[PDB]
Design a protein around this ligand. Structure first.
Ligand SMILES: Nc1ncnc2c1ncn2[C@@H]1O[C@H](COP(=O)(O)OP(=O)(O)OP(=O)(O)O)[C@@H](O)[C@H]1O
Ligand SMILES: Nc1ncnc2c1ncn2[C@@H]1O[C@H](COP(=O)(O)OP(=O)(O)OP(=O)(O)O)[C@@H](O)[C@H]1O
Ligand SMILES: [Mg+2]
Ligand SMILES: [Mg+2]
Lengths: 476, 469, 56, 468, 127, 119
């Protein structure tokens, strides 16, 4: 039949007798009105994970079958709202009134239904867009030590999507309710709530809800992808899902493994991260992209969860605490961070300029570790150090101030060609604002030419003429 | 409809309710027994329900010693969780885990009692206003400002200065604040609680304070539930009366450890480093309740014990995501005699944003961290290459960094026995003014030994004159 | 003096070459010991976990 | 017939009961095909691989796809044999799953035969005793790291060096000159990289000479574990029936070791060192002992390997190195400088390099090339601090020789014709050995360094010099 | 068999390390408690039951003799590890082979300084 | 037994003085592994010079070892070990080379072994 009775209750898990026809992954309802998900089908008992308060469920209480898999609401109606992992509102702005509801455990797009990634996802961060480029349909991991900027890079990225036809989803996982309130308020202040959805499963919410949050985040983000529109999903900590999954598995009595995690921990993040894709023209050409975040203890890049996700994604952005406590912000280590879609996820303008940046910056990472203290060396080494110091000042940037690609390629072009050789290393930041102020008068000219033509090869004569004559006449 | 004890396994006990009317999870049970013969012993015990087993049986955790318990005794179901007295009649008292008085002043006559387990506030009714709360301590007031209405965490290993820092904060913040104060000694020394109570009695601060203990010698059941008893009392002043309140807690690690000690006996599979499979869930139910709502604010200072100076241990690592300010105490500074031993690189807060603090406060704090971070990497090299091989910019950074690191030290009022000095208070403007002269090189001539256990920067010049330089 | 300054720079060049080589050799021997410790800690930790799970 | 029923389900693991007492063998394949009876149910098309005989007429099995929607009491059928896949020439230019079903939307495969995934290896009475060198036509590999026929070769390299181009060029050369096909097994691959490979195979015309089998990362542990054995059974038919020499490519052998570790944990087996399965060396052997040079024909394999923490002593790299015959290293510095293919001449090695197998001049030319290139690597930090004019006449005479030899290792590939004007070049072992011997004696030192850059045989460098 | 009759015999084991790995596999499948590197406690008794059988007999027993040449592979060239040290404690000496000698042309690649025979010196002819 | 009450006063001073020099040389050991002994000056340099001689004079040719090396075995009385180490510590044998204290019995053997070398 479709009815059972609870036999054991504890720590957010229940065991029931009966329920002969339950399906693996189905939803079940308790006499209390609370919901649960059936995850184990033993020979004589069903193992149920509770989706609510469990201190009201007693041994001998009845449970009934709902004949349905886990399903969430989807549509444009969710834009500007705050919701829980089950698709219920949290902002207190009234009901959602959705038109359709769909499963949380859909299969990923096959190898023939995809198309190569070739269109950019501008983050507005000088170090990321130039050296570690992201394309629509890609998966880029943000990984680092605690308190290094991570939520900052994800929110600076969402703020930059105001002009483009992109929809953003933010999944708050295991986060404190007061930090979630500062994130929602920051998005409302920058006007990002016009094109974003927030899914939250905070630290006091049941382990079950904190486990279904990213899957519900993909169901909402891939809806726009199947309509031809672009979408972006962000997971603030994937390290917190692994912990929430470890609890449910060790309580259901499933065999443990490395760091007590169950054998299917690689499969958990793989089912999720392979759903980000750029589809083919037969499917409408849509695109979903993901920004998973990971927390590493004292730089343990070789721990079980960091190695699983580093192997699954199309690249990673490493943040370091010694860079952070030394003034380099955002604290991204350019030497260890890579994008495997580089040279295709960039516009022609950036590809021409970033080539020189890669060589100048690569020769600097090696040289400063040893030649920083020495008083007199060969002029080549002096010029390599002086250029590397100036380029590492151009890559520094403050929070909530993302740069449009047209402004980025202009400043990088000026630095790479070496027009800053007479400018002191402390003055480089003042030069960026002063040069961009002169360019405000030319924004009408260079915005239309760099945005439409993207031809920095033709533009060389105008950039050289303005940069040299304007500064040499004023500085002499 | 009563129950019977079936298994006694140290702290854990199993009870069977034959009628089928079983107690809910977290309910409180009573064992009151009078000895029938000369062989038996009189017993008075409380146990809380933890898990529902199959054959009309429940697992329960005892809040006191289980010695003298016999299989087949009689158990009474109270019908609700551990309910603690709440109201203004709890002020100037000291309490047990069950909210009973541990002082000899007589019974408490509070008209209401509240259960220690309550749902946390919702996202729709929280608040997050930002202002600077002064401590009078040179390091905390500059490098990691305390947010009013926010959680503060003091992290450290054994004997680094945590309790001597909590005590100085109580004698500074609470002594400069109108409103109630609450203190919970979670699994600490019963000798320290006695000295705190006497200091309060002398000063007169007990009239505005509440104390809860359940110390190291108590069983695991009491050591984890004590923090909830102190919290249900600080919540009544916020939610019912509307007043702002301070919650001070020493050793929140004992709450995590006590949960791990009982987890194996309940039947739960073990997890990483020998912790329970529910560590993050149990710390979140505690930390998510200590927040500022639309009605009133709870400012909280917590001391965290790091088992072997390794911040990567599950209990300290799980704690870091909940704080608004974190201060790390390092034995490296303590062994050099630099107290309070706060690490100037690893210490941070939600308030070190250019939009919240003054311009020079932000500049001085960022310059201190850069000079000390540069010195940290360079001092290691000097041990193998020797100080003669480094450049003039490096020598200048070494000389200034030594003086900066020593000026971070201060004599506390509670540390007179350990320091042989009376104790001093430094206001924020003097902390900023003092550190700026060292960074700008004004005092390059003053010896590095004129900054240990000093107060204001004027004293360093007077002390150098007393040293005949 | 010309020969003395040249021989001083030559002597320091050889001394620094040997010091760097001694440090590079010490780094590989320490790296191998750290890898042995890393693998030993992981097998010990996983066996304490499985022993506890088997007991329960 | 005989039929079982599902009795337990938890993640990828499923348990089945056979009430009549007729039970399936330890590696048989079982099918679950069910049509929803009521609106509450879901239709399913799953398959399971047997793992253990538990007792009381029950068997434990690993799942090849998702187990969501399954119900206890659902009937199941035994196929009477292991997983079976199509074999023959009809599998050339097509895409497949672990089960042998096609991924391509190119209709069904009507192959004349189907072979089981689990087959015993060839015995000592069926092998070839004297080793042969497989001519790749690539100067660097054929000269400094010879490939044994029937051997296992290991690929170690960083991102952005040109691994795919080399695979594609190796896949070509064996089909054109040796008249032999190739097979590619993507063990737990990223479905976005599988897409780029299929399109570049299609644009280069290479698909008609190769078979591609993909096990994606989004698949359960059981499916990612067996994908190498279905790629191998397809390569086995070309050796046993057609008698041809074959190339088998495995993108990452570490993902095969990892998938077995996850399947062992799910089955409940006590872990070994670093948490790997107790059967790690027997699982690696049952794969690697089927890749051999028999008397009829041979299967050679190029396998890439991921080192878990830059530690070669980890149990997965350790058990694989026991079976390998050669090592090929790909470096980013050669790619940044402009040398293609980007193969490191001082870190790549093979067991075939001894003078008892290679000719005396082949050994001498390889030893002299390594000695000159090693000596030049020493001078590089001296050249960074001081000028070229200051070096001794003998030192300069070695720096010049080394740069020209390093450039003569470079070769214009045939697969590269879409990205550059260079047509492509195949260089026999006898021609590359002859060419480097002339360079080492200084016969061509009065020639520009650009004459040796991106060229094939030595006579082409002479004509390129005459054109300038 | 040859040794009991009176004839001399030699035995070679191509890898004792592979033998130990094959034993760790069945002990862990039988669910026996693991030790130092997941190997069971019986790992010393394993190599001891076999190596002790090699022996030179007394004239009363017919004077025959069995001799053994066990082989061990060691990761990164360090002698101080569980299986290597177990067999070094059982044998009558050891011959050390080094990789830098082998890849530099010195063959056979035997370390003359650290290799020793404990029974040696008495078994050599006077010449 | 290494307590002032059980051993002779001369034995106790010599044994304690030997462990101090051996501990001091184990502290210098981690820095000389990189820089070598060219940087060391005065007492730290003199301490390694005596510590080398002391570490070698603790080596002894055994009677059971005659089957491994052609050297005859030796038995050294307590009065001879105390006198030999005392003279090494005091510096009376600072002129003798460090290679003259390898596998010897008594201190007089080091004097003739040095005389055999002639260095
Ligand atoms: N570019 C920047 N300039 C100045 N300060 C910065 C910059 N980027 C990050 N920070 C600061 O560093 C901290 C980074 O906080 P963030 O939330 O991004 O870190 P996190 O890794 O996500 O921390 P957590 O794990 O607690 O969530 C904040 O104090 C932030 O204001
Ligand atoms: N400000 C200070 N001035 C001088 N000495 C101090 C100071 N702070 C701490 N100490 C010294 O360090 C010791 C640290 O004891 P403390 O009670 O603070 O340990 P703790 O860090 O709190 O450890 P625990 O939490 O386990 O009690 C003191 O007893 C005293 O000797
Ligand atoms: Mg964050
Ligand atoms: Mg304390």
């Amino acid at each position: 039949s479709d009815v059972g009775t609870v036999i054991q209750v504890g720590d957010g898990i229940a065991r029931a007798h009966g329920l002969d026809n339950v399906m693996s992954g189905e939803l079940v309802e308790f006499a209390n009105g609370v919901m649960g998900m059936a995850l184990n089908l033993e020979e004589n008992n069903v193992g149920i994970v509770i989706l609510g308060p469990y201190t009201g469920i007693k041994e001998g209480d009845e449970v009934r079958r709902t004949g349905r898999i886990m399903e969430v609401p989807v549509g444009e109606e969710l834009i500007g709202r705050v919701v829980n992992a089950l698709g219920q509102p949290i902002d207190g702005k009234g009901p959602i009134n959705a038109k359709e509801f769909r499963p949380v455990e859909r299969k990923a797009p096959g190898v023939v239904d995809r198309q190569p990634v070739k269109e950019p996802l501008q983050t507005g961060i000088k170090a990321i867009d130039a050296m570690i480029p992201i394309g629509r349909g890609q998966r880029e991991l943000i990984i680092g030590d605690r308190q290094t900027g991570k939520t900052a890079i994800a929110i600076d990225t969402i703020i930059n999507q105001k002009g483009q036809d992109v929809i953003c989803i933010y999944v708050a996982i295991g986060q404190k309710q007061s930090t979630v309130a500062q994130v929602v308020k920051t998005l409302e202040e920058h006007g990002a709530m016009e094109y974003t959805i927030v899914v939250a499963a905070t630290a006091s919410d049941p382990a079950a809800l904190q486990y279904i949050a990213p899957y519900a985040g993909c169901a909402m983000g891939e809806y726009f992808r199947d309509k031809g529109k672009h979408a972006l999903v962000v997971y603030d900590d994937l390290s917190k899902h692994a912990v929430a999954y470890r609890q449910i598995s060790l309580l259901l009595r499933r065999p443990p493994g490395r760091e007590a995690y169950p054998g299917d921990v690689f499969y958990l993040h793989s089912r999720l991260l392979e759903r980000a894709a750029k589809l083919s023209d037969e499917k409408g050409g849509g695109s979903l992209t993901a920004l998973p975040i990971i927390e590493t203890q004292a730089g343990d890049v070789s721990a079980y969860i960091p190695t699983n996700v580093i192997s699954i994604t199309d690249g990673q952005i490493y943040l370091e605490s010694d860079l952070f406590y030394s003034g380099i912000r955002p604290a991204i280590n350019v030497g260890l961070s890579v994008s495997r879609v580089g040279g295709a996820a960039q516009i022609k303008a950036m590809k021409q300029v970033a080539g020189k940046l890669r060589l100048d910056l690569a020769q600097y990472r090696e040289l400063q570790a040893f030649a920083q203290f020495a008083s007199d060396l060969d002029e080549a080494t002096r010029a390599q150090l002086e250029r590397g110091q100036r380029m590492t000042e151009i890559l520094k940037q403050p929070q909530y101030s993302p740069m449009p690609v047209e402004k980025q390629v202009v400043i990088i072009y000026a630095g790479t060609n070496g027009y800053l050789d007479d400018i002191p290393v402390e003055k480089v930041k003042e030069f960026e604002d002063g040069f961009l102020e002169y360019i405000e008068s030319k924004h009408p000219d260079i915005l239309e030419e760099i945005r439409e033509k993207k031809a920095l090869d033709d533009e060389l004569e105008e950039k050289l003429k303005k940069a040299i004559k304007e500064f040499k006449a004023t500085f002499k | 409809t009563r129950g019977r004890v079936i298994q006694v396994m140290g702290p854990v006990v199993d009870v069977k309710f034959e009628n089928g009317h079983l107690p809910a999870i977290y309910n409180a049970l009573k064992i009151q027994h009078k000895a029938r013969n000369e062989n038996e012993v009189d017993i008075d015990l409380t146990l809380e329900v933890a898990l529902h087993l199959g054959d009309d049986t429940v697992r329960t955790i005892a809040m006191a010693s289980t010695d003298g318990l016999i299989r087949g005794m009689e158990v009474i179901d109270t019908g609700a969780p551990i309910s603690v007295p709440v109201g203004p009649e709890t002020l100037g008292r000291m309490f047990d885990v069950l909210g009973e008085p541990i002082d000899e002043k007589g019974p408490v006559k509070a008209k209401k009692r509240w259960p220690i387990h309550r749902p946390p506030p919702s996202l729709s009714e929280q608040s997050t206003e930002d202002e600077i709360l002064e401590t009078g301590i040179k390091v905390i007031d500059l490098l990691a400002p305390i947010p009013k209405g926010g959680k503060i965490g003091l992290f450290g290993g054994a004997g680094v200065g945590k309790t001597v820092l909590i005590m100085e904060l109580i004698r500074n913040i609470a002594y400069e604040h109108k409103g109630f104060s609450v203190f919970a000694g979670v699994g600490e020394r019963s000798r320290e609680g006695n000295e705190l109570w006497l200091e309060m009695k002398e000063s007169g601060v007990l009239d505005n304070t509440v104390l809860v203990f359940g110390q190291m010698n108590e069983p695991p059941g009491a050591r984890f539930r004590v923090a909830l008893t102190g919290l249900t009392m600080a919540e009544y002043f916020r939610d019912e009366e509307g007043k702002d309140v301070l919650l001070f807690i020493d050793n929140i690690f004992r709450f995590a450890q006590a949960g791990s000690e009982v987890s194996a006996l309940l039947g739960r599979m073990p997890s990483e480093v020998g912790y329970q499979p529910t560590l993050a869930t149990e710390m979140a139910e505690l930390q998510e309740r200590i927040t500022s709502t639309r009605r009133g604010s709870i400012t909280s200072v917590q001391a965290i014990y790091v088992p072997a100076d390794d911040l990567t241990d599950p209990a300290p690592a799980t704690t870091f995501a909940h704080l608004d300010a974190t201060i790390v105490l390092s034995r490296e500074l303590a062994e050099k005699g630099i107290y309070p031993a706060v690490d100037p690189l690893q210490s941070t807060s939600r308030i070190m944003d250019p939009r919240i603090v003054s311009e020079e406060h932000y500049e001085v704090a960022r310059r201190v961290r850069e000079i000390l971070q540069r010195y940290k990497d360079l001092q290691d090299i000097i041990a193998i290459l020797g100080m003669e091989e480094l450049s003039e910019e490096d020598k200048l950074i070494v000389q200034r960094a030594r003086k900066i690191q020593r000026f971070l030290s201060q004599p506390f009022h509670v540390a007179e026995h350990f320091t042989g000095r009376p104790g001093k208070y430094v206001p924020i403007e003097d902390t900023i003014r003092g550190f700026k002269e060292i960074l700008d090189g004004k005092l390059d001539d003053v010896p590095e030994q004129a900054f240990y256990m000093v107060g204001t920067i004027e004293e360093a010049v007077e002390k150098a004159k007393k040293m005949k330089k | 003096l010309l020969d003395a300054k040249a021989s001083e720079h030559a002597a320091r060049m050889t001394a620094m070459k040997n010091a760097t080589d001694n440090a590079n050799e010490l780094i590989r021997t320490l790296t191998l010991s750290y890898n042995r410790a890393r693998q030993a800690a992981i097998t010990q930790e996983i066996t304490e976990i499985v022993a506890g799970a088997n007991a329960l």
